[PDB]
Design a protein around this ligand. Structure first.
Ligand SMILES: C[N+](C)(C)CCO
Length: 255
């Protein structure tokens, strides 16, 4: 069960760097259409896996799709290959802050304490860098509410056919109301995002969000590994330290 969330970290961490690889080749020539086609291509490779409490899903999906994911997409233009991932990784603190007050109290002396060290090893480097940090704070508020609102239903509603299916078509319908090689990189980015968000939901089913979201912020270390090997990040001395505090806290939350 625990690996399912650890798999959610690496796969979104590699995918959120190939999205930076997409923008790095034209420098945000198209801000918004990337996210609209993102869910458009996502529905088809999500349905490729094939071969009412719906309100609680849609009210958290519009709280993290129209304002959470695409803000991580367009509102994070070039501030960093992972510099948005760091401060958007305080979202478990916003999620645990909401989860503890909505009939979910299962934390220990070294379960949220590992989340605390994971945030303090990031906030210290947060200012080692306006619009980018704004939405990166917004992505933290949005995904943290979605994690509890996704865990809200989570009964007679499977992680795929109701959890991630309604979550995808809701944001895809939202952009419909708000409105070659790139399609290969887009469908490649869609292929990595959809195994990730399902694996995050499979970790949300059996494992509590306080630990499932806490193992997810491993997506901050893999998003620097992919961003320094596939992309050649400068990796100053402060990067290895923040990479260590976020994994040193991962081994406190996992145990
Ligand atoms: C994929 N998100 C990072 C948006 C959710 C955590 O898995």
């Amino acid at each position: 069960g625990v690996p399912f969330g650890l798999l959610s970290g690496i796969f979104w961490g590699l995918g959120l760097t190939v999205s930076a690889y997409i923008f790095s080749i034209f420098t945000d020539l198209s801000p918004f259409v990337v996210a609209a086609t993102h869910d458009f291509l996502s529905i088809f490779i999500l349905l490729a896996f094939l071969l009412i409490r719906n309100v609680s899903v849609i009210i958290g999906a519009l709280l993290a799709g129209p304002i959470g994911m695409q803000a991580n997409l367009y509102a994070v233009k070039y501030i960093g290959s992972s510099l948005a991932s760091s401060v958007s990784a305080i979202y478990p603190a916003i999620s645990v802050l909401l989860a503890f007050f909505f009939l979910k109290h299962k934390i220990s002396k070294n379960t949220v304490f590992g989340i605390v060290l994971i945030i303090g090893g990031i906030i210290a480097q947060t200012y080692k860098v306006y619009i980018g940090i704004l939405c990166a704070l917004v992505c933290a508020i949005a995904w943290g509410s979605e994690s509890v609102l996704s865990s809200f239903a989570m009964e007679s509603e499977l992680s795929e056919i109701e959890a991630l299916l309604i979550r995808q078509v809701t944001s895809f319908l939202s952009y419909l109301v708000i409105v070659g090689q790139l399609l290969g990189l887009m469908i490649v980015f869609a292929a990595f995002d959809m195994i990730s968000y399902l694996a995050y939901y499979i970790a949300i089913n059996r494992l509590q969000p306080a630990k499932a979201t806490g193992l997810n912020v491993s997506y901050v270390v893999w998003t620097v590994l992919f961003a320094v090997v596939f992309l050649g990040a400068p990796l100053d001395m402060l990067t290895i330290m923040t990479s260590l505090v976020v994994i040193a806290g991962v081994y406190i939350i996992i145990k």
